[PDB]
Amino acid sequence: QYHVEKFSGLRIRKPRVSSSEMERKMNGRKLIRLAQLQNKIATEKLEEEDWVTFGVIVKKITPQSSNNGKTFSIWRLNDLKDLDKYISLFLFGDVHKEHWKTDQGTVIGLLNANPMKPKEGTDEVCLSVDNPQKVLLMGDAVDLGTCKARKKNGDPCTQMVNLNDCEYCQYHV
Ligand SMILES: [Zn+2]
Incomplete structure (x- = not known):
């Protein structure tokens, strides 16, 4: 609940990840601020990056499907640095099963997520992850x-x- 975390620039109540263990996970990766995602996907050169990004769960949607399985959830993310830029994280199957009860306001690390297909009518960046370990819970955004x-x-x-x-x-x- 006091002084800032190096990588996200946010101060975290009850941190969940060793300072050392963060540098470890962060090693050799590219820190891409959430606001830079739209353009890197558009210029079609995000894939070639081993990238990490950081967001606070500002809002959780747990909408309707059960389509064949199968429940999923959506998280709205903001980095508290570019207060205008938001992205939507889609959690499916494994990843949902694993993280969907996470508390709103949790700061998370998101690694090498996959851009969803773009839907007509939106200005919106949406991403999913092929693996539970791509979402790192870091603690509360104080x-x-x-x-x-x-x-x-x-x-x-x-x-x-x-x-x-x-x-x-x-x-x-
Ligand atoms: Zn105001």
């Missing part, structure tokens, strides 16, 4: 927060914020 201001009207502002970097959102300074 700074996941909301703009402290009030919507110049009534109601409190609802904009997402990094409580350790800034307490107000972009639109209130």
Whole structure:
């Protein structure tokens, strides 16, 4: 719950991974910030990377299918650094079975995920993983927060914020 984690730049309540063991897993890999994913997939040169990325589970969807099996879930991720950039992580079969009860607000490491086929109508980056071990639970995002201001009207502002970097959102300074 105090000072920052080297790789994600977030401070984590009750960390789950040795400092050493992080450098170990991180070794020889490329750190790609979540915001850089869209372009690397578009320019079609993400595959050739042995890459790692970091997100906070901002939201969990556990929608409908049972199509032939078979339940799955979706996580909305944000790095609390580019508060505008989000990606969606699809968990299927093994991976769902294994991680789907993870608490929202958990910071995760995501390694060498697979881009989903792009769906008409979206601006959206979606990825899945062929293996439970591609998702590294690192602990709680102690700074996941909301703009402290009030919507110049009534109601409190609802904009997402990094409580350790800034307490107000972009639109209130
Ligand atoms: Zn605000």
